[PDB]
């Protein structure tokens, strides 16, 4: 337990929220009800995904080699590979628009002919609940709860579908990076970004969180489980004691109401531990006092 850093990071008071999907809608799979009541303590959570250029500073110091460049490949969205041929190793299976890319990481984050020079602030990705977890140990932080991070993505609202309130597109206007157009063949980057976005595009919610919807993935420190709300603690909810996959929430850059609307402030995902690709990434987290 490295001395402990706040930095980058708000302090939210917690209290009593609603969590869980207030309208229904949700897929039911993911366990998104029931809307159950849970009690927080206050704690910090970083206002940002962290960066490139953050997460760079960790691997300057630590020579810590990522999940993606230990198994040699990571996915890389097929419409921005940018390898040569004899890099791709052909379409991840089940979904033909992940690319395999030999050599694709968080520096390269589109495979070997690309770099991450111009995009310092942009939040990091080819991160596994591995790397995150390590990154935040290394920074004096831990990563959030889902609990943890649902609450501090509601902004201080309760019951909405968004972190900004129902409408998506409030007035008519994007304040969110995900996908518009016929996926997954055209993007019209109507929210101003095909693929990442920098870390504080838009607006911050109500606690000061930027981009808690879409943009990347985020890695939670619970273990996935669709029964757990009708099971959990009231307070400080950890998630169950084993499980599968770890969770994700918050939707990315390619999230579309056609199959994955999953930027909805209570929709949930998941994914196994050691698992990467160009869409996901973290924020860390802190206890509070
Ligand atoms: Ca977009
Ligand atoms: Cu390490
Ligand atoms: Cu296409
Ligand atoms: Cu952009
Ligand atoms: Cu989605």
């Not at 920074?139 to 709860?145: M, S």
């Not at 890695?219 to 998630?239: I, K, L, N, Q, R």
């Not at 199959?259 to 973290?282: E, I, K, W």
Request: charged residues 20%; contains cysteine.
């Amino acid at each position: 337990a490295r001395p402990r850093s706040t930095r980058g990071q708000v302090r939210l008071p917690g209290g009593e929220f609603a969590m869980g999907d207030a309208f229904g809608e949700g897929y039911p799979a993911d366990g998104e009800t029931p809307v159950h009541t849970v009690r927080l303590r206050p704690f910090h959570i970083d206002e940002t995904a962290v960066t490139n250029a953050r997460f760079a500073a960790f691997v300057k110091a630590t020579g810590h080699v990522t999940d993606a460049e230990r198994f040699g490949s990571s996915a890389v969205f097929h419409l921005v590979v940018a390898a040569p041929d004899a890099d791709v190793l052909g379409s991840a299976a089940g979904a033909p628009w992940w690319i395999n890319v030999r050599g694709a990481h968080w520096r390269r984050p589109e495979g070997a002919r690309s770099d991450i020079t111009g995009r310092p602030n942009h939040p990091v990705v080819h991160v596994s609940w591995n790397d995150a977890t390590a990154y935040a140990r290394w920074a004096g932080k831990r990563l959030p709860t889902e609990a943890e991070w649902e609450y501090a993505a509601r902004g201080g609202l309760a019951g909405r579908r968004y972190a900004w309130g129902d409408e998506l597109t409030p007035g008519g206007r994007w304040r969110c990076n995900i996908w518009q157009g016929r996926f997954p063949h055209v993007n019209t980057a109507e929210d101003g970004h095909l693929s990442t976005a920098p870390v504080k595009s838009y607006r911050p919610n109500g606690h000061g969180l930027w981009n808690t919807a879409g943009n990347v993935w985020e890695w939670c420190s619970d273990w996935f489980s669709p029964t757990y709300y009708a099971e959990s603690p009231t307070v400080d909810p950890h998630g169950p004691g084993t499980g599968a996959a770890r969770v994700l929430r918050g939707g990315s850059y390619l999230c579309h109401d056609s199959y994955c609307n999953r930027y909805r402030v209570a929709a949930r995902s998941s994914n196994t531990p050691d698992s990467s690709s160009g869409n996901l990434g973290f924020r860390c987290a802190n206890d509070a006092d």
